Amino acid sequence: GHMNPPPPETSNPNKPKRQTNQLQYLLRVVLKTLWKHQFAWPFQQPVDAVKLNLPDYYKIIKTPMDMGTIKKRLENNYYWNAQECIQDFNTMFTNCYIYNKPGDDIVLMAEALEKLFLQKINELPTEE
């Protein structure tokens, strides 16, 4: 534990909003494809350090990120540029690699998800 921090902010009415084909793709294709993956479930919500009894998790990870937060930030037009969203997915994978040991089952899961993420990002449509 001892306590989990509050989840990352997903909405801000002060931030200007815009819909772009790249942001639409990140939600409709990238997030959706990663969400349905067999290894997605531990990445769908913040790390529950209390349930897992990991008091050092939020001592090590100061920038937590999960797909449920990315989903809500996309639905709330929290990102202005697609690069901000791509960065949150990169933070999510990086936190897993920093916290856990290489070869751990959770790391192998994050790696398969990252492989699928990078394939979809290679297919990111040109800005319209």
Whichever of 7 and 125 has its CB closer to ligand YW4, that residue is: 7
Residue 105 burial class via C-beta count within 10 angstroms: exposed 0-12, middle 13-18, buried 19 and up: exposed
Using the rule CB under 6 A, is 60 a contact of ligand YW4?
no
Cα separation, 2 vs 39, in Å, equals 27
Instruction: Select the residue whose beta carbon is closest to ligand YW4 and give its number.
Output: 48
Using the rule CB under 6 A, is 34 a contact of ligand YW4?
no
Pick from 85, 86, 96, 113 the residue near ligand YW4 by CB under 6 A.
96
53: left (phi over 0), alpha (psi -120 to 50) or beta: left
Pick from 29, 40, 106, 112 the residue near ligand YW4 by CB under 6 A.
106
Using the rule CB under 6 A, is 58 a contact of ligand YW4?
no
Cα separation, 85 vs 27, in Å, equals 10
Q: Which stretch binds ligand YW4 (CB under 6 A): 11-19, 77-85, 104-112, 115-123?
A: 104-112
Instruction: Give the largest CA-CA distance in the chain.
Output: 47
Using the rule CB under 6 A, is 40 a contact of ligand YW4?
no
Angle among Cα 37, 121, 126 to the nearest 5 degrees reads 135
Instruction: Name the residues that contact ligand YW4, by CB under 6 A.
Output: 42-43, 45, 47-48, 51-52, 96, 99-100, 105-106, 109
